[PDB]
Amino acid sequence: DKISHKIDIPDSAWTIGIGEKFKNAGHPNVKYPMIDDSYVQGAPLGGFGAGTIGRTYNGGFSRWHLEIGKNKYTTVYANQFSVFQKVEGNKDGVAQVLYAGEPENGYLSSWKWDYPKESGMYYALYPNSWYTYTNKDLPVQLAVKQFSPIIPYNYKETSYPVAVFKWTAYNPTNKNVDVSIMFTWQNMIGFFGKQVNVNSGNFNKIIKDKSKDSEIVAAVMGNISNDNEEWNGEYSIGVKKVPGVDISYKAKFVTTGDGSDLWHEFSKNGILDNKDDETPTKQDGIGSAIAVNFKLQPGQTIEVPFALSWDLPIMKFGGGDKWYKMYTKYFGKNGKNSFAILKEALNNYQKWEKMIDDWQKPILSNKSKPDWYKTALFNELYYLADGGTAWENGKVGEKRTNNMFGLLECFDYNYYETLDVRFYGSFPLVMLWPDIEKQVMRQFADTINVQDSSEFKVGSNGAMAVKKVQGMIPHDLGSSYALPWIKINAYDWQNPNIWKDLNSKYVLLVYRDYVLTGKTDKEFLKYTWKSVKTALDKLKEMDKDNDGIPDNEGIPDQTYDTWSMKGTSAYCGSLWLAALKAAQEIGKVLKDNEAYIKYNEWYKIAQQNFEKELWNGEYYNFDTESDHKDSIMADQLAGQWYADILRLGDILPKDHVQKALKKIYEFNVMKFENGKMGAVNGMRPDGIVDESDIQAQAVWTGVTYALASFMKYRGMTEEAYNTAYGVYKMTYDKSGKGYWFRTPEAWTKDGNYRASMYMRPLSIWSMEVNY
Ligand SMILES: OC[C@H]1O[C@@H](O)[C@H](O)[C@@H](O)[C@@H]1O
Ligand SMILES: [Ca+2]
């Protein structure tokens, strides 16, 4: 490996060998079908609301999130980078697809597949990833840096459906070498969203943009139809000329054939036929190819950028609603703009690299923080783009001043912005894209007094319940299978209208968003104040025994939606205390004296009673009435966690908080697989895992990172990092379970999982709240 020193890979990048087999991978631990796309994954490409494309460490374009809200894992084998190399004065050269694999069927059988093992590495530090190619049969070594412009406090480039591939080639040998790099892409119009005739009308064209001292050559892969539908638009790939390189292209090769129409040209001398051909296809799949060729002298390096764009302006949801995607604000809505997007990237990618370096640098340059932590912190952010993210710029047909946003909980449970989960998972948004975060919270504020009296069947018990009760915060803002933002509470396993955490979590999220954006946004507090008061007043009515605290009802009436709580719970009860303290503080800011007085009085009574009912001398009991009420819950003081972040002070005595966190570390972490897998949710006082429910005996990745945050700002530094380390290790390490770029909700002690690609572990960013 002589190429690594010509490029700049941070030491904290996650790494794996190209073609590496992983032996220890986890699988779903549930009874019902659940997504398992394997460990062959990589950092995604694409902006927020754009649809994303997962290119794996083996090089394939395989995890397709272009249909917003859907996860489709299938390798489109035509989509590749390939290399030709010939030592000057040899008879023949060699050509190789840079993919550690081959197709299932006979299509593209002419190409040289099966990039060999031990011949390159993949590196990822989201939003950047890299591949190096150090192959004994390729005298020139190559690397590529690939990324999309995901940039905090930037709501423009961050939305773009674009990826840059910046190649570096270096000749360490004593001979001249002829080198070509070729990007191939299938015209994927009709890959999703088209019910019949999936290739029909697809056509490819070549654009040559020759301005002064500059040239871009691109293929635009579209359809002759001007229908404004989810399936229609354009893909583009292309390259920018640099000194020393020539460009060649082929507009049309057949992807549903043996591929020799393209490959006979490239394998001969690395130079394509430059044949334009706009003939539309009928049944056959087609694609385009863009190549560069250059000669490298001994010791010489060259850099060449390629790019990929996709203008698919319309997202459709299963209930029928069609929306424009966010990026259409900047490029237009007609679906004929892929070249413009591509050109913008090719002309500005160096600036974008610098902007990415500027935001990563403060963390990367802090030498008190271990590299493993940095690996997890940046790489967990894959989910903001990859989580079915929807960001609308208008309903198709009919303009407001805001752009509605939603991130899925996950794909298995296809719910937008699940509030009991976003309590943990929305940290990166408040800290890095706060205008989005406030928009999401205003969305929730608007739903609080919605009433929907129609009934649904509750999954856990078969009872019928009202869909949405006035004054109760909803569980979620709909499903991609139905009507995001319009039909809320898509979730039905439990009835969220009787949850005891949603209303308190809502208030805490509101006050968080004010505090962590500098305590200046009074207008945001004003917008949400009526909803905050309503939320707390409604929850207070669920106090059945007059101790001033809502009563859990002996069912799973909160985020641990199979783990029953009864009476006063540490979890919901601490959240209630913190929510009351937040509302007091908002009361003061807004000069609502009577609210301050009321919530202050509620707080004093509740706080006194919480302490009396649950403090046992070492920790706070799980609750006052359950069968294992004295279990040690990892999340028992979630309210105090948030109160620390919100600078609300002590809701409980410092000494007791400290004792409880020490107990959690000593038990839930260190007595669960030697502290190498995170914090188990429930432990019995004798040091054995609580087995009363599957949730009690799992580690929740987001709970655990949040607990690490809580420990850290209570000065338990070693405990904090050791607790977080088990999550990092299981996710990313060779001794883990192979969950990189699909961090799950939960795993049991065997390492097997529930719900890959989950929002909750974005809570790692709560470990950085001074950002
Ligand atoms: O894993 C537990 C989670 O399951 C999801 O299906 C629910 O939508 C969440 O509210 C819950 O917290
Ligand atoms: Ca009560």
**What residue segments make up the domains of the chain, in order of their start?**
1-364, 365-771
Is residue 549 a known part of a binding site?
Answer: yes
* Cβ of residue 613 lying under 6 Å from some atom of ligand 1: no
Tokens of 627: 């069968």
Residues 331, 337: contact at Cβ < 8 Å? Answer: yes
User: Rounded to 10 degrees, what is the CA torsion of 717, 718, 719, 724?
Assistant: 90
- Most distant CA pair in the chain, distance: 91
Ligand 1: residue of 410, 415, 419, 421 to mutate (most ligand atoms within 8 A of CB) is 421
Strands 464-468 and 452-457: antiparallel
State how far the Cα of 308 lies from the Cα of 183, in Å rounded to an integer. 10
- Going from the Cα of 581 to the center of ligand 2, the distance in angstroms, rounded, reads 18
What crossing angle do the helices spanning 502-515 and 638-645 adopt, rounded to 10°?
Answer: 20
State how far the Cα of 708 lies from the Cα of 700, in Å rounded to an integer. 12
* Cβ of residue 415 lying under 6 Å from some atom of ligand 1: yes
Is residue 545 a known part of a binding site?
Answer: yes
Sheet of strand 314-316: strand arrangement = 314-316, 322-325, 390-395, 405-406
Among 147, 162, 159, 189, which Cα is nearest to 343's? 162
Residues 759, 418: contact at Cβ < 8 Å? Answer: yes
* Cβ of residue 585 lying under 6 Å from some atom of ligand 1: no
Question: For ligand 1, what atom is nearest to the CA of residue 421?
Answer: 12
- Going from the Cα of 477 to the center of ligand 1, the distance in angstroms, rounded, reads 14
State how far the Cα of 281 lies from the Cα of 199, in Å rounded to an integer. 7
* CA 720 from centre of chain: 24
Tokens of 114: 């099966």
Residues 601, 536: contact at Cβ < 8 Å? Answer: no
Among 302, 326, 295, which Cα is nearest to 313's? 326
What type of residue is 344?
Answer: E
**DSSP state for residue 380 in the 8-state scheme:** T
Residues 723, 708: contact at Cβ < 8 Å? Answer: yes
State how far the Cα of 532 lies from the Cα of 386, in Å rounded to an integer. 31
Among 765, 727, 79, 72, which Cα is nearest to 383's? 765
* Cβ of residue 339 lying under 6 Å from some atom of ligand 1: no
End-to-end CA separation in angstroms for the chain:
36
Alpha carbon distances (Å) from 742 to 43, 60, 205, 758, 760? 10, 17, 36, 7, 12
Query: Before 127, cis peptide (omega within 30)?
Result: yes
Tokens of 484: 């995001």
* CA R_g for the chain: 27
Please identify which residue in the block is written with the tokens 């966010």.
326
Which residue owns the Cα nearest ligand 1 atom 10?
A: 559
* Cβ of residue 745 lying under 6 Å from some atom of ligand 1: yes
Among 748, 758, 760, which Cα is nearest to 26's? 748
Alpha carbon distances (Å) from 197 to 73, 230, 259, 281, 506? 22, 15, 22, 10, 47
Residues 6+ apart with CB under 8 A from 363: 369, 374, 377, 378, 768
State how far the Cα of 687 lies from the Cα of 672, in Å rounded to an integer. 9
Is residue 341 a known part of a binding site?
Answer: no
Cβ-count burial of 328 within 10 angstroms (0-12 exposed, 13-18 middle, 19+ buried)?
A: buried
Sheet of strand 753-754: strand arrangement = 699-700, 746-747, 753-754
Residues 499, 558: contact at Cβ < 8 Å? Answer: yes
Tokens of 115: 């990039």
Sheet of strand 52-55: strand arrangement = 44-45, 52-55, 61-65, 72-73
Among 433, 554, 379, which Cα is nearest to 151's? 433
* CA 217 from centre of chain: 32
Ligand 1: residue of 561, 571, 695, 758 to mutate (most ligand atoms within 8 A of CB) is 561
What type of residue is 634?
Answer: A
Cβ-count burial of 723 within 10 angstroms (0-12 exposed, 13-18 middle, 19+ buried)?
A: buried
* Cβ of residue 418 lying under 6 Å from some atom of ligand 1: yes
Question: For ligand 1, what atom is nearest to the CA of residue 562?
Answer: 2
- Report the 3 state secondary structure along 552-618: EEEECCCCCCCCCEEECEHHHHHHHHHHHHHHHHHHHHCCCHHHHHHHHHHHHHHHHHHHHHHECCC
**DSSP state for residue 684 in the 8-state scheme:** -
Tokens of 276: 């334009």
State how far the Cα of 707 lies from the Cα of 280, in Å rounded to an integer. 57
Experimental method: X-ray
- Going from the Cα of 700 to the center of ligand 1, the distance in angstroms, rounded, reads 11
Measured on CA atoms in the order 512, 515, 517, 523, is the torsion positive or negative?
positive
Which residue owns the Cα nearest ligand 1 atom 1?
A: 745
* Cβ of residue 417 lying under 6 Å from some atom of ligand 1: no
Report the SS3 class of residue 267. helix
Is residue 311 a known part of a binding site?
Answer: no
Residues 756, 386: contact at Cβ < 8 Å? Answer: no
- Going from the Cα of 137 to the center of ligand 2, the distance in angstroms, rounded, reads 73
State how far the Cα of 166 lies from the Cα of 164, in Å rounded to an integer. 6
Is residue 284 a known part of a binding site?
Answer: no
Cβ-count burial of 402 within 10 angstroms (0-12 exposed, 13-18 middle, 19+ buried)?
A: exposed
| Number of helical H runs and strand E runs in the chain | 16, 31
Residues surrounding ion ligand 2 at CB below 5 Å: 543, 545, 547, 549, 551
Report the SS3 class of residue 386. helix
Sheet of strand 80-87: strand arrangement = 94-97, 80-87, 177-186, 286-296, 246-254
State how far the Cα of 603 lies from the Cα of 611, in Å rounded to an integer. 12
State how far the Cα of 434 lies from the Cα of 510, in Å rounded to an integer. 12
User: Rounded to 10 degrees, what is the CA torsion of 408, 410, 411, 412?
Assistant: -140
- Going from the Cα of 648 to the center of ligand 1, the distance in angstroms, rounded, reads 28
* Cβ of residue 420 lying under 6 Å from some atom of ligand 1: yes
Alpha carbon distances (Å) from 176 to 83, 135, 169, 230? 16, 17, 13, 49
State how far the Cα of 75 lies from the Cα of 67, in Å rounded to an integer. 16
- Going from the Cα of 552 to the center of ligand 2, the distance in angstroms, rounded, reads 8
- Going from the Cα of 501 to the center of ligand 2, the distance in angstroms, rounded, reads 14
Report the SS3 class of residue 683. strand
- Going from the Cα of 537 to the center of ligand 2, the distance in angstroms, rounded, reads 14
Report the SS3 class of residue 536. helix
* Cβ of residue 14 lying under 6 Å from some atom of ligand 1: no
Residues 4, 130: contact at Cβ < 8 Å? Answer: no
Measured on CA atoms in the order 24, 30, 31, 36, is the torsion positive or negative?
negative
State how far the Cα of 417 lies from the Cα of 512, in Å rounded to an integer. 16
* Cβ of residue 724 lying under 6 Å from some atom of ligand 1: no
* Cβ of residue 409 lying under 6 Å from some atom of ligand 1: yes
Query: What resolution in angstroms, rounded to 1 decimal?
Result: 1.9
* Cβ of residue 491 lying under 6 Å from some atom of ligand 1: yes
State how far the Cα of 41 lies from the Cα of 24, in Å rounded to an integer. 15
Q: Give the residue ranges of DSSP H helices in 164-246.
A: none
Report the SS3 class of residue 104. coil
* Cβ of residue 635 lying under 6 Å from some atom of ligand 1: no
- Going from the Cα of 315 to the center of ligand 1, the distance in angstroms, rounded, reads 25
State how far the Cα of 195 lies from the Cα of 188, in Å rounded to an integer. 14
Question: For ligand 1, what atom is nearest to the CA of residue 413?
Answer: 6
State how far the Cα of 177 lies from the Cα of 299, in Å rounded to an integer. 11
Residues 440, 405: contact at Cβ < 8 Å? Answer: yes
**DSSP state for residue 757 in the 8-state scheme:** S
Which residue owns the Cα nearest ligand 1 atom 6?
A: 413
Query: Which ligand is the nearest neighbour of the Cα of 602?
Result: 2
State how far the Cα of 68 lies from the Cα of 47, in Å rounded to an integer. 12
State how far the Cα of 339 lies from the Cα of 751, in Å rounded to an integer. 45
**DSSP letter for each residue of 306-352:** EEEEEE--EEE-TTS-EEEETTHHHH-SSS--HHHHHHHHHHHHHHH
